[PDB]
Coordinates of C-alpha atoms in Angstrom, one line a residue:
Chain K
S199 CA 15.9 -2.6 3.2
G200 CA 14.2 0.1 4.4
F201 CA 11.0 0.2 6.2
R202 CA 7.7 0.9 4.4
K203 CA 4.1 0.8 5.1
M204 CA 2.8 -2.2 3.6
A205 CA -0.6 -4.0 2.4
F206 CA -0.4 -8.0 2.9
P207 CA -1.0 -9.7 -0.5
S208 CA -4.6 -9.2 -1.8
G209 CA -4.6 -11.9 -3.9
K210 CA -6.7 -14.1 -2.0
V211 CA -9.2 -11.5 -1.3
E212 CA -9.0 -11.0 -4.9
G213 CA -10.7 -13.8 -5.5
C214 CA -13.7 -13.1 -3.6
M215 CA -14.8 -9.8 -4.8
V216 CA -17.8 -10.0 -7.0
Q217 CA -20.5 -7.3 -7.7
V218 CA -24.0 -7.2 -6.2
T219 CA -27.3 -5.5 -7.7
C220 CA -30.5 -4.7 -6.5
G221 CA -32.7 -2.3 -8.7
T222 CA -29.8 0.4 -9.3
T223 CA -28.0 -0.3 -6.7
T224 CA -24.8 -1.5 -6.8
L225 CA -22.0 -2.5 -4.5
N226 CA -19.3 -5.3 -3.8
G227 CA -20.1 -8.4 -2.5
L228 CA -17.3 -11.2 -0.6
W229 CA -17.9 -14.7 -1.6
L230 CA -16.6 -17.4 0.3
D231 CA -17.8 -21.0 -0.4
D232 CA -21.5 -20.4 -1.2
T233 CA -22.5 -17.8 0.7
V234 CA -22.0 -13.7 -0.7
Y235 CA -21.8 -11.1 1.9
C236 CA -22.7 -7.3 1.4
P237 CA -23.8 -4.1 3.2
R238 CA -27.7 -4.8 3.2
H239 CA -28.2 -1.0 2.1
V240 CA -27.7 -2.6 -1.2
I241 CA -32.0 -3.0 -1.2
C242 CA -31.9 0.5 -0.6
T243 CA -32.5 3.9 -3.8
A244 CA -32.2 7.5 -2.3
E245 CA -35.5 8.5 -0.1
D246 CA -34.2 4.9 1.6
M247 CA -31.3 5.6 3.1
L248 CA -33.3 8.3 5.3
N249 CA -34.4 5.0 8.1
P250 CA -35.4 2.3 5.9
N251 CA -36.8 0.0 7.6
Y252 CA -34.6 -3.1 6.0
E253 CA -36.8 -5.6 7.4
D254 CA -40.2 -4.0 5.9
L255 CA -38.0 -3.2 2.2
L256 CA -36.1 -6.9 2.9
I257 CA -39.7 -8.4 2.5
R258 CA -40.2 -6.8 -0.8
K259 CA -37.4 -8.9 -2.2
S260 CA -36.9 -12.1 -3.4
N261 CA -34.0 -14.1 -4.4
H262 CA -34.1 -13.0 -8.1
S263 CA -34.2 -9.1 -7.0
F264 CA -30.4 -10.0 -6.5
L265 CA -28.0 -9.8 -9.8
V266 CA -25.0 -11.2 -8.4
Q267 CA -21.5 -10.9 -10.9
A268 CA -18.1 -13.1 -10.4
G269 CA -16.0 -12.1 -13.5
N270 CA -18.6 -12.2 -16.5
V271 CA -20.6 -14.7 -14.8
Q272 CA -23.7 -14.4 -12.9
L273 CA -24.2 -16.6 -9.7
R274 CA -27.9 -17.4 -9.6
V275 CA -29.3 -16.7 -5.9
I276 CA -30.9 -19.5 -4.5
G277 CA -31.2 -18.0 -0.9
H278 CA -30.8 -14.7 1.1
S279 CA -31.6 -12.6 4.3
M280 CA -30.1 -10.2 7.1
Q281 CA -27.5 -11.1 9.5
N282 CA -26.9 -7.3 11.0
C283 CA -26.2 -4.6 9.1
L284 CA -25.2 -7.4 6.1
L285 CA -27.0 -9.1 3.8
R286 CA -26.1 -12.7 3.4
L287 CA -26.9 -14.1 -0.2
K288 CA -26.6 -17.9 -0.9
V289 CA -25.2 -19.1 -4.6
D290 CA -25.4 -22.2 -6.6
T291 CA -22.1 -21.9 -7.0
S292 CA -18.9 -22.1 -4.3
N293 CA -16.6 -19.7 -4.8
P294 CA -13.3 -22.7 -6.7
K295 CA -10.8 -19.4 -5.2
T296 CA -12.0 -19.6 -1.0
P297 CA -9.1 -19.1 0.7
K298 CA -8.8 -20.5 4.1
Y299 CA -10.4 -17.6 6.3
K300 CA -12.2 -16.4 9.6
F301 CA -14.2 -13.4 10.6
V302 CA -12.8 -11.5 13.6
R303 CA -13.9 -8.2 15.0
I304 CA -10.3 -6.2 15.5
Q305 CA -10.2 -3.8 17.8
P306 CA -9.1 0.1 17.9
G307 CA -5.4 1.0 17.2
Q308 CA -5.5 -2.2 15.0
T309 CA -4.6 -2.1 11.3
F310 CA -5.2 -4.1 8.2
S311 CA -5.5 -4.2 4.6
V312 CA -7.9 -2.8 2.7
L313 CA -9.0 -3.5 -1.0
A314 CA -11.0 -1.0 -2.4
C315 CA -13.2 -2.2 -5.0
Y316 CA -16.2 -1.3 -7.9
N317 CA -18.3 -3.7 -9.8
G318 CA -16.8 -6.1 -7.7
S319 CA -13.5 -5.3 -9.5
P320 CA -10.5 -4.7 -7.4
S321 CA -8.8 -1.6 -7.8
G322 CA -6.2 -0.8 -4.9
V323 CA -5.0 -1.8 -1.7
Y324 CA -3.8 0.0 1.4
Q325 CA -2.9 -0.3 4.7
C326 CA -4.8 1.7 7.4
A327 CA -5.4 1.7 11.2
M328 CA -9.0 1.2 13.0
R329 CA -8.8 4.8 14.8
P330 CA -9.4 4.6 18.6
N331 CA -12.5 6.6 17.4
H332 CA -13.6 3.8 15.7
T333 CA -13.3 5.0 12.1
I334 CA -11.0 4.7 9.2
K335 CA -9.0 7.5 7.3
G336 CA -9.8 5.2 4.2
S337 CA -10.0 6.6 0.5
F338 CA -13.3 5.0 -1.0
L339 CA -15.2 6.4 -4.0
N340 CA -18.8 5.6 -4.6
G341 CA -19.8 2.5 -5.0
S342 CA -17.0 1.6 -2.7
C343 CA -19.3 -0.1 -0.6
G344 CA -18.7 -3.4 0.2
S345 CA -15.2 -3.3 0.0
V346 CA -13.4 -5.5 2.8
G347 CA -10.4 -4.4 5.4
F348 CA -8.5 -7.8 5.8
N349 CA -5.1 -9.7 7.7
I350 CA -3.2 -12.6 6.4
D351 CA -1.6 -15.3 9.1
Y352 CA 0.3 -17.8 7.2
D353 CA -2.5 -19.1 4.5
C354 CA -5.4 -18.1 6.6
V355 CA -7.4 -14.5 5.6
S356 CA -8.9 -12.9 8.4
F357 CA -11.6 -11.2 7.4
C358 CA -12.7 -7.2 9.9
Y359 CA -13.8 -5.1 7.9
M360 CA -17.0 -4.5 5.4
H361 CA -17.6 -1.0 3.6
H362 CA -20.6 0.9 4.5
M363 CA -20.4 4.8 4.7
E364 CA -18.5 7.7 4.4
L365 CA -18.9 10.5 7.3
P366 CA -19.2 14.2 7.0
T367 CA -15.4 14.2 7.9
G368 CA -14.7 12.7 4.9
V369 CA -13.2 8.8 7.6
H370 CA -15.3 6.1 7.0
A371 CA -17.4 4.0 9.0
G372 CA -18.8 0.0 8.2
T373 CA -18.9 -3.5 10.1
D374 CA -17.4 -6.6 11.0
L375 CA -18.2 -9.6 8.6
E376 CA -20.8 -10.2 11.5
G377 CA -22.4 -7.0 10.2
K378 CA -22.0 -5.4 13.5
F379 CA -20.8 -1.9 13.0
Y380 CA -17.9 -1.3 14.6
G381 CA -18.3 2.4 16.8
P382 CA -21.9 3.6 17.0
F383 CA -22.7 4.3 13.6
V384 CA -25.2 3.2 12.0
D385 CA -26.4 2.5 8.1
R386 CA -29.6 5.1 7.6
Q387 CA -28.4 9.0 7.1
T388 CA -28.7 11.1 11.0
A389 CA -26.3 13.7 12.3
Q390 CA -24.1 11.0 13.2
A391 CA -20.3 12.4 12.9
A392 CA -16.2 10.9 14.0
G393 CA -15.9 11.7 17.7
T394 CA -13.0 13.3 18.6
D395 CA -9.8 11.1 17.8
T396 CA -6.6 10.7 19.5
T397 CA -3.2 9.2 18.1
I398 CA -2.8 5.3 19.1
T399 CA 0.2 5.4 21.4
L400 CA 0.9 1.7 21.1
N401 CA 1.8 2.1 17.4
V402 CA 3.4 5.0 18.0
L403 CA 6.2 3.2 20.5
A404 CA 6.4 0.1 18.0
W405 CA 7.0 2.6 15.1
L406 CA 10.0 3.4 17.8
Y407 CA 11.3 -0.4 18.2
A408 CA 11.5 -0.8 14.3
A409 CA 12.9 2.6 14.2
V410 CA 15.6 1.4 16.8
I411 CA 16.0 -2.0 15.0
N412 CA 16.9 -0.4 11.7
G413 CA 19.6 1.4 13.7
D414 CA 17.9 4.6 14.1
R415 CA 18.4 5.3 18.0
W416 CA 19.6 8.8 18.0
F417 CA 16.1 9.5 20.1
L418 CA 16.7 7.0 22.9
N419 CA 18.1 8.4 26.7
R420 CA 19.2 6.7 29.4
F421 CA 16.7 8.0 31.8
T422 CA 12.6 6.4 33.0
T423 CA 9.3 7.5 33.5
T424 CA 6.7 6.4 35.4
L425 CA 3.3 5.1 33.5
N426 CA 1.3 7.8 35.3
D427 CA 3.4 10.4 34.5
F428 CA 4.1 9.6 30.7
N429 CA 0.3 9.7 30.3
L430 CA -0.1 13.0 32.2
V431 CA 2.4 14.0 29.0
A432 CA 1.1 11.9 26.2
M433 CA -2.6 12.9 27.2
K434 CA -1.4 16.7 26.4
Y435 CA -0.5 15.9 23.4
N436 CA -3.9 13.9 22.1
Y437 CA -2.4 10.4 22.6
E438 CA -4.0 7.7 23.6
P439 CA -3.7 6.8 27.6
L440 CA -1.2 3.6 27.8
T441 CA -1.7 0.7 29.6
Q442 CA -0.1 -1.5 31.6
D443 CA -2.0 -3.7 28.4
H444 CA -0.2 -1.9 25.9
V445 CA 3.0 -2.3 28.0
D446 CA 3.2 -5.8 27.9
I447 CA 1.4 -5.9 24.4
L448 CA 4.9 -4.0 24.0
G449 CA 7.1 -7.1 25.7
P450 CA 8.7 -9.1 22.4
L451 CA 10.0 -5.4 20.8
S452 CA 11.1 -4.9 24.3
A453 CA 13.0 -8.2 24.9
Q454 CA 14.5 -8.1 21.1
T455 CA 15.8 -4.1 22.0
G456 CA 16.2 -4.7 25.5
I457 CA 15.1 -1.6 26.1
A458 CA 12.4 -1.4 28.7
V459 CA 8.9 -0.1 27.2
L460 CA 9.0 2.6 30.1
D461 CA 12.4 3.4 29.0
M462 CA 11.6 4.0 25.6
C463 CA 8.6 6.1 26.6
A464 CA 10.8 8.7 28.0
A465 CA 12.4 8.4 24.5
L466 CA 9.2 9.5 23.6
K467 CA 8.0 12.0 26.1
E468 CA 11.4 14.0 25.4
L469 CA 10.2 13.9 21.4
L470 CA 6.8 15.4 22.1
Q471 CA 8.2 17.8 24.3
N472 CA 10.8 19.3 22.1
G473 CA 10.2 17.8 18.7
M474 CA 12.6 16.1 16.6
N475 CA 14.9 19.4 15.7
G476 CA 15.3 18.6 12.0
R477 CA 15.6 14.8 11.9
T478 CA 14.4 12.2 11.2
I479 CA 13.5 8.3 12.2
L480 CA 13.1 5.9 9.9
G481 CA 13.3 8.5 7.1
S482 CA 10.0 10.6 8.7
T483 CA 9.6 13.9 10.0
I484 CA 6.7 13.1 12.0
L485 CA 5.9 9.7 14.4
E486 CA 4.0 7.3 13.0
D487 CA 0.6 5.5 13.9
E488 CA -0.2 3.1 12.3
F489 CA 2.2 0.0 12.7
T490 CA 1.4 -2.5 15.5
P491 CA 3.6 -3.9 17.2
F492 CA 2.6 -7.4 15.4
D493 CA 3.4 -5.2 12.0
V494 CA 6.8 -4.3 12.8
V495 CA 7.5 -8.4 14.3
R496 CA 6.1 -9.6 10.8
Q497 CA 8.1 -6.9 8.7
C498 CA 11.4 -7.1 10.6
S499 CA 11.6 -10.3 10.1
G500 CA 10.5 -10.9 6.2
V501 CA 7.2 -12.9 7.1
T502 CA 5.7 -14.1 3.8
Chain X
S1332 CA -13.5 10.9 -0.2
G1333 CA -9.8 10.5 1.6
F1334 CA -6.5 9.6 0.2
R1335 CA -3.8 7.1 0.3
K1336 CA -0.5 5.8 -1.2
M1337 CA -2.1 2.9 -2.3
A1338 CA -1.2 -0.1 -5.0
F1339 CA -2.6 -1.9 -7.3
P1340 CA -4.3 -5.4 -6.5
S1341 CA -1.5 -7.4 -6.4
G1342 CA -2.6 -11.0 -6.9
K1343 CA -2.5 -11.1 -10.9
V1344 CA 1.9 -11.1 -10.1
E1345 CA 1.5 -13.0 -7.3
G1346 CA 0.1 -16.2 -9.2
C1347 CA 3.6 -15.6 -11.6
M1348 CA 6.2 -15.7 -8.6
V1349 CA 8.4 -18.6 -8.2
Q1350 CA 11.8 -19.5 -6.7
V1351 CA 15.2 -19.9 -8.3
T1352 CA 18.0 -21.4 -6.7
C1353 CA 21.6 -22.4 -8.5
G1354 CA 24.1 -23.1 -6.6
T1355 CA 23.9 -21.8 -2.8
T1356 CA 22.2 -18.7 -4.0
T1357 CA 18.4 -17.9 -3.8
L1358 CA 15.9 -15.3 -5.2
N1359 CA 12.9 -14.5 -6.8
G1360 CA 11.9 -15.3 -10.4
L1361 CA 8.8 -14.1 -12.4
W1362 CA 6.7 -16.7 -14.3
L1363 CA 5.2 -15.8 -17.0
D1364 CA 4.0 -18.5 -19.8
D1365 CA 7.3 -21.0 -20.0
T1366 CA 9.7 -18.7 -18.7
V1367 CA 11.2 -17.2 -15.7
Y1368 CA 12.8 -14.4 -15.6
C1369 CA 15.6 -13.8 -12.8
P1370 CA 18.5 -11.5 -12.1
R1371 CA 21.5 -12.7 -13.7
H1372 CA 23.5 -12.0 -10.2
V1373 CA 21.8 -15.7 -9.2
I1374 CA 24.7 -17.8 -10.6
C1375 CA 27.6 -15.5 -9.2
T1376 CA 29.7 -16.4 -6.0
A1377 CA 30.5 -14.5 -3.2
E1378 CA 34.1 -13.7 -4.8
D1379 CA 32.1 -13.5 -8.1
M1380 CA 29.8 -10.8 -7.5
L1381 CA 33.3 -8.4 -7.0
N1382 CA 34.4 -8.7 -10.5
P1383 CA 32.3 -10.9 -12.8
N1384 CA 32.1 -11.5 -16.8
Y1385 CA 28.5 -12.8 -16.7
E1386 CA 29.3 -14.3 -20.3
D1387 CA 32.1 -16.2 -18.5
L1388 CA 30.3 -17.6 -16.0
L1389 CA 27.2 -18.7 -17.7
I1390 CA 28.8 -20.7 -20.2
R1391 CA 29.8 -22.6 -17.5
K1392 CA 26.5 -23.5 -16.2
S1393 CA 23.6 -26.3 -17.8
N1394 CA 19.9 -26.1 -17.8
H1395 CA 20.4 -28.9 -14.7
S1396 CA 22.5 -25.5 -12.7
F1397 CA 19.0 -24.4 -12.1
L1398 CA 17.0 -24.9 -9.6
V1399 CA 13.5 -23.5 -10.4
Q1400 CA 9.9 -23.9 -7.7
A1401 CA 6.7 -23.1 -7.7
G1402 CA 6.0 -23.4 -4.4
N1403 CA 7.0 -26.9 -3.3
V1404 CA 6.9 -28.0 -7.1
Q1405 CA 10.5 -28.0 -9.3
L1406 CA 10.0 -27.0 -12.8
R1407 CA 12.4 -29.0 -15.2
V1408 CA 14.5 -26.5 -16.8
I1409 CA 14.6 -27.4 -20.5
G1410 CA 16.6 -23.8 -21.7
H1411 CA 18.9 -21.1 -20.8
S1412 CA 19.8 -17.8 -22.1
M1413 CA 21.1 -14.4 -21.1
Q1414 CA 19.2 -11.0 -21.7
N1415 CA 21.3 -7.7 -20.4
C1416 CA 21.1 -8.2 -16.5
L1417 CA 18.5 -11.4 -16.7
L1418 CA 18.7 -14.8 -16.7
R1419 CA 15.8 -16.7 -19.1
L1420 CA 14.7 -19.8 -17.8
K1421 CA 12.7 -21.8 -20.0
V1422 CA 10.8 -24.6 -18.2
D1423 CA 8.8 -27.7 -19.3
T1424 CA 5.8 -26.3 -18.0
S1425 CA 3.5 -23.2 -18.5
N1426 CA 2.0 -20.9 -16.0
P1427 CA -1.7 -21.5 -15.9
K1428 CA -2.0 -18.3 -13.7
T1429 CA 0.2 -16.1 -16.5
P1430 CA -2.2 -12.7 -17.0
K1431 CA -3.0 -10.6 -20.0
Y1432 CA 1.2 -9.0 -20.2
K1433 CA 4.0 -5.9 -21.4
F1434 CA 7.2 -5.3 -20.7
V1435 CA 7.0 -1.4 -20.5
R1436 CA 10.4 0.8 -19.6
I1437 CA 9.5 3.4 -16.9
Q1438 CA 10.2 7.3 -16.8
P1439 CA 11.9 8.6 -13.3
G1440 CA 9.0 10.3 -11.8
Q1441 CA 6.4 8.0 -12.5
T1442 CA 4.8 4.9 -10.0
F1443 CA 4.5 1.6 -9.5
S1444 CA 3.9 -1.2 -7.1
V1445 CA 6.4 -3.5 -5.9
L1446 CA 5.1 -7.2 -4.9
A1447 CA 7.9 -7.7 -2.0
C1448 CA 8.9 -11.7 -2.3
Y1449 CA 11.4 -14.1 -0.1
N1450 CA 11.5 -17.2 -1.5
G1451 CA 9.8 -17.0 -4.2
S1452 CA 6.7 -16.2 -2.4
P1453 CA 4.5 -13.1 -1.9
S1454 CA 5.3 -10.5 1.6
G1455 CA 4.1 -7.6 1.1
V1456 CA 2.5 -4.8 -1.5
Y1457 CA 3.1 -1.2 -1.5
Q1458 CA 3.3 1.6 -3.9
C1459 CA 6.6 4.0 -5.0
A1460 CA 7.8 6.3 -7.3
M1461 CA 11.1 6.5 -9.3
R1462 CA 13.3 8.8 -8.3
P1463 CA 14.6 11.2 -10.7
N1464 CA 18.1 9.4 -9.8
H1465 CA 17.2 6.3 -11.1
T1466 CA 16.8 4.5 -7.5
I1467 CA 13.7 3.5 -5.7
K1468 CA 13.0 4.2 -1.8
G1469 CA 11.4 0.7 -1.2
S1470 CA 12.6 -1.4 2.0
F1471 CA 14.2 -4.4 0.5
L1472 CA 15.2 -7.3 3.2
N1473 CA 17.9 -9.9 1.9
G1474 CA 16.2 -12.1 -0.6
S1475 CA 14.4 -9.7 -2.0
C1476 CA 16.0 -9.7 -5.5
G1477 CA 14.0 -10.9 -8.2
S1478 CA 10.8 -9.2 -6.7
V1479 CA 9.0 -7.2 -9.3
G1480 CA 7.4 -3.3 -9.9
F1481 CA 4.3 -3.3 -12.3
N1482 CA 1.4 -1.1 -12.7
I1483 CA -2.5 -3.0 -13.8
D1484 CA -4.4 -1.2 -16.5
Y1485 CA -7.4 -3.0 -16.7
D1486 CA -6.5 -6.9 -17.0
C1487 CA -3.0 -6.3 -18.7
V1488 CA 0.2 -6.1 -16.2
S1489 CA 2.9 -4.1 -17.5
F1490 CA 5.7 -5.2 -15.8
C1491 CA 8.7 -2.3 -15.3
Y1492 CA 11.0 -3.4 -12.9
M1493 CA 13.4 -6.5 -11.7
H1494 CA 14.8 -6.1 -8.4
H1495 CA 18.5 -6.1 -7.8
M1496 CA 20.4 -4.4 -5.4
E1497 CA 20.8 -2.6 -2.4
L1498 CA 23.4 0.7 -2.4
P1499 CA 24.7 2.1 0.4
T1500 CA 22.5 4.8 1.2
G1501 CA 19.8 2.4 1.4
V1502 CA 18.2 2.6 -1.5
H1503 CA 17.5 0.4 -4.4
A1504 CA 18.2 -0.2 -8.3
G1505 CA 17.1 -2.9 -10.4
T1506 CA 16.2 -3.0 -14.3
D1507 CA 13.0 -3.2 -16.6
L1508 CA 12.1 -6.8 -17.9
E1509 CA 14.4 -6.8 -20.7
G1510 CA 17.2 -7.0 -18.7
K1511 CA 18.7 -3.0 -18.4
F1512 CA 19.5 -1.2 -15.1
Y1513 CA 17.7 2.0 -14.2
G1514 CA 20.7 4.5 -13.5
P1515 CA 23.8 3.9 -14.4
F1516 CA 24.2 1.0 -12.3
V1517 CA 25.8 -2.0 -12.4
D1518 CA 25.0 -5.5 -10.7
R1519 CA 28.7 -6.2 -9.0
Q1520 CA 29.9 -5.3 -5.5
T1521 CA 32.0 -1.9 -6.1
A1522 CA 31.6 2.1 -5.7
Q1523 CA 28.5 3.1 -7.8
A1524 CA 26.3 5.7 -5.5
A1525 CA 23.0 6.8 -6.2
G1526 CA 23.0 10.4 -7.7
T1527 CA 22.0 13.6 -6.4
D1528 CA 17.7 13.5 -6.1
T1529 CA 15.1 16.1 -6.6
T1530 CA 11.6 16.5 -5.6
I1531 CA 9.5 15.8 -8.3
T1532 CA 7.7 19.2 -9.3
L1533 CA 4.5 17.8 -11.5
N1534 CA 3.7 15.0 -8.7
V1535 CA 3.9 17.8 -5.7
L1536 CA 1.9 19.9 -7.8
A1537 CA -0.8 16.8 -8.6
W1538 CA -1.2 15.9 -5.3
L1539 CA -2.2 19.6 -4.3
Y1540 CA -5.0 19.5 -6.5
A1541 CA -5.8 16.2 -5.2
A1542 CA -5.9 18.2 -2.0
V1543 CA -7.9 20.4 -3.8
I1544 CA -10.4 18.0 -4.6
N1545 CA -10.8 16.7 -0.7
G1546 CA -12.3 19.8 -0.1
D1547 CA -9.1 21.9 0.9
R1548 CA -8.0 24.8 -0.2
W1549 CA -6.0 26.5 2.5
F1550 CA -2.7 26.7 1.0
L1551 CA -4.5 28.4 -2.0
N1552 CA -3.9 32.4 -2.7
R1553 CA -4.6 35.2 -4.9
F1554 CA -1.4 35.0 -7.0
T1555 CA -0.1 33.6 -10.2
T1556 CA 3.5 33.3 -11.2
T1557 CA 4.9 32.5 -14.5
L1558 CA 6.9 29.6 -15.4
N1559 CA 10.2 31.2 -15.3
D1560 CA 9.8 32.7 -12.0
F1561 CA 8.3 29.2 -10.5
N1562 CA 11.5 27.3 -11.9
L1563 CA 13.8 30.2 -10.3
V1564 CA 12.1 29.3 -7.0
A1565 CA 11.3 25.8 -7.2
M1566 CA 14.7 25.4 -8.0
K1567 CA 16.5 26.5 -4.3
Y1568 CA 14.6 24.0 -3.2
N1569 CA 15.6 21.2 -4.9
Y1570 CA 12.5 20.6 -7.2
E1571 CA 12.9 19.2 -11.0
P1572 CA 12.3 21.9 -13.4
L1573 CA 9.1 22.4 -14.7
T1574 CA 8.6 22.1 -18.0
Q1575 CA 5.5 23.1 -20.5
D1576 CA 4.7 19.5 -21.0
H1577 CA 4.5 18.5 -17.5
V1578 CA 1.8 22.0 -16.9
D1579 CA -0.2 20.6 -20.0
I1580 CA -0.4 16.9 -18.1
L1581 CA -2.0 19.0 -15.5
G1582 CA -4.6 20.7 -17.3
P1583 CA -7.5 17.7 -16.7
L1584 CA -7.3 18.2 -12.7
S1585 CA -6.7 22.7 -13.8
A1586 CA -10.3 22.2 -15.2
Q1587 CA -11.7 19.8 -12.6
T1588 CA -11.1 22.0 -9.6
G1589 CA -11.1 25.8 -11.4
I1590 CA -7.5 26.3 -10.0
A1591 CA -5.0 27.5 -12.8
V1592 CA -1.7 24.9 -12.9
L1593 CA 0.3 28.6 -13.1
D1594 CA -1.9 29.5 -9.7
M1595 CA -1.1 26.1 -7.9
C1596 CA 2.5 26.7 -8.8
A1597 CA 2.3 29.7 -7.3
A1598 CA 0.4 28.4 -4.0
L1599 CA 3.5 25.6 -4.0
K1600 CA 5.6 28.5 -4.5
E1601 CA 4.4 30.1 -1.3
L1602 CA 4.7 26.8 0.3
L1603 CA 8.4 26.2 0.0
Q1604 CA 9.0 29.9 1.0
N1605 CA 6.8 30.1 3.8
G1606 CA 6.0 26.3 5.1
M1607 CA 3.3 25.1 6.7
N1608 CA 3.1 26.5 9.4
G1609 CA 1.6 23.4 12.0
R1610 CA -0.6 23.2 9.4
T1611 CA -1.2 19.5 7.4
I1612 CA -2.4 18.9 3.7
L1613 CA -4.2 15.2 3.0
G1614 CA -2.8 14.8 6.7
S1615 CA 0.6 15.0 5.9
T1616 CA 3.5 17.9 7.1
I1617 CA 5.8 17.2 4.1
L1618 CA 5.1 17.8 0.6
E1619 CA 4.4 14.0 -1.6
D1620 CA 5.7 14.1 -4.3
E1621 CA 5.5 9.9 -5.2
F1622 CA 1.4 10.5 -6.6
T1623 CA 1.7 11.8 -10.6
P1624 CA -1.1 13.2 -11.7
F1625 CA -2.2 10.0 -13.7
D1626 CA -2.8 8.4 -10.0
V1627 CA -4.6 11.5 -9.1
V1628 CA -7.1 11.3 -11.4
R1629 CA -7.7 7.5 -10.5
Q1630 CA -8.2 7.8 -6.7
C1631 CA -9.7 10.8 -6.7
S1632 CA -13.7 11.3 -7.5
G1633 CA -14.7 12.9 -10.6

């Protein structure tokens, strides 16, 4: 085997995607049981985004204002409401394809799979990470709002992201499935922009462990470093400060390889200060930061 | 905006994955209608793989020598035959989840999605390219044999690859859904090794166009080049020779961006000679060749 960035199989989420139309505005909605969740801004025109009064805008709306379509079938909306930045449409049919699921709010650095959708039709799936600056570097075109991000564990789909907008830098912002935005972003037009971003140290470290697991270990050394000394270095390279909590999160990988985290940090320190000298790690020339400690375990163990 | 190495949604394929066992060997099979397709080497023993005669090994088997399972449920095998390097097992029930599909043989340089499976259960999906040398760089652990590669057009699944083995360098080899190997590889333990490979020039150019569409043009220049002079340079860096057909394929992206194909070639020529100088393109520090012109057009805005 080799080591590739992988997305979770997307079947369980494909079965939950529908198209939600309100006037001339169409986007994607997630259908679980008899509820369809979508970005509340589906009830907005152009000039509306410039600080719309969603409360007021919603009143002017009625169940028939919403056109929900699953496959080539219209789902009759029998109720509607707002939950933070999401619209909750009650429909007359419980999704027969509803998987076991839960809604979770992901933390910065964590990864998930995104099912890009258009007109309620899945078009592609990719793995990405919630950046330390609370945005995601995704790939979305107009009409992708409502697309969701998720993780799967056994048979349970953990929904963690719903797409709402693109920022001036071309990165993305969205909410958890309770409608609460990740970061300080809002669903209206403002001068809002992504703050400065950093490299996800925890993930880089997890990735170095995966490399060692796969026999790529030329970068290892016989030294170690203190947490504080590691951070004086990492931060110079725009790496996120490493916490004792991150150290503990890496415990299982540290135990599997018998390489203490601070010993691996000493290796990382050397790599940042001197580069790779033309060599590669897992066939890469750069330090990857979109694999969590959990991702490496999952993959380096063939979890299905 | 943004650009990711994305795969096709795998749902339509997940509903076709099953487990096939024969003796002590288990691997994945693809269940369509009333037929299950899998690598013929499922019938082989440890020694058998050193110099197996498949016709001779299969004649000694019967329908009941095969254990096909859809999840926890056994599918009764009521027929079996060999087609090139694949085993075709007829089962007594039809797969209600069978999508619209077709079997296609892909050309080197083209891309496809792979649904990595183990014991007939989906593990993950990733996008990759058939290298010019016919191998794929795909991360396949012991037991992934039988996993398939595919592309999806509308609602039609075009299956193009079935995983068979791993080569000494760690890259992978397989067949199309008719059981014909991509490359000169054979299904048995031997000295075979992946051949010389090249960077897929057409794809790198497609990617550079993607970079421009996403509003990034630092690598562009005021130069142009002839196809000939470009190949004289690219080939020095282990790039596949570029043909006029390739140039023509890039026509639409060329038109969309206003950048002439030969002009983009000049940019690429400069990048190969000068390197990136600490800069990146679409967040990458190296030139990527796993996105075809079709992929770029599909993922990028119009």
